[PDB]
Predict the 3D structure of the following.
Amino acid sequence: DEEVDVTSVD
Amino acid sequence: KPNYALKFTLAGHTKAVSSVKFSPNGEWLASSSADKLIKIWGAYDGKFEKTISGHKLGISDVAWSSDSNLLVSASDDKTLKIWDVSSGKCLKTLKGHSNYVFCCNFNPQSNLIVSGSFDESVRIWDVKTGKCLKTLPAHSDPVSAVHFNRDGSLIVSSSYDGLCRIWDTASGQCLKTLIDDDNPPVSFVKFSPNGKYILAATLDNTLKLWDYSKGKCLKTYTGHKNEKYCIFANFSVTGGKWIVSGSEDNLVYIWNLQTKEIVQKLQGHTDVVISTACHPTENIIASAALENDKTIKLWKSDC
Amino acid sequence: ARTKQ
């Protein structure tokens, strides 16, 4: 359900 | 979709393989076995490198330092050992747990090591001295995994007791307990590369992605078989973004991180696929199996 | 061990 960034540290 | 395809099979261990991990520089693969042994392999060619002896009983886990120079391993011999990789020296032997050591890991700084054991506890050790710094009374059943986050500030732990707990490394204080609806034994746990999330394997054939702050389960990944063994899992992020994980039906499963559907199923092994690992920079996956198979496989992808 | 059960 909706995107999820597991790489970016912001 | 990824296109992972078999490039190498690595024979060597004479008993079930327990865990593989890519060195941080992406030169080596490290493996541990029920055969009391660790073996090093070239990450790209599968060319065997060396063997590392010392534990008195089998090994359940191994883990690289940040500079790819040292290794730590967790053995049924109630201990952990630290190893200079190129010399093959046993630098320290960490005594402390009162039963099998099952999992282990370096903090990014790599001055620390965290471990987990059947004695239901989590210990934090000093690399330089082999001394047990803290002893968290973490769980009420054996501990299946332990992992630092991006900056070593947090440790995550899991257990057959149903729980995933987050700990403050400095104080040893439990900052969070993760409760689902049913709480099946928790067989693996790991942070996302950025630390914001948590990936957790559970003996009901389910994997879940948790947001660590809000403490809520976001994604769910299924389709595989996992009811008996503690199978490693991964975030693949070198190419597209996937979830990789061994399986008790002898296959390597791959999920689309977002939509959560199986985007590939690798075939090859002949017994439970107990461990997987994703190369630091290249789209390479390493896999390993139990007593009846005992080989390690490397698959590569363009995506 | 992790490989027994």
User: Anything to note?
Assistant: The radius of gyration of chain A is 8 Å. Chain A touches chain B at residues 1, 3-9 (CB under 8 Å).
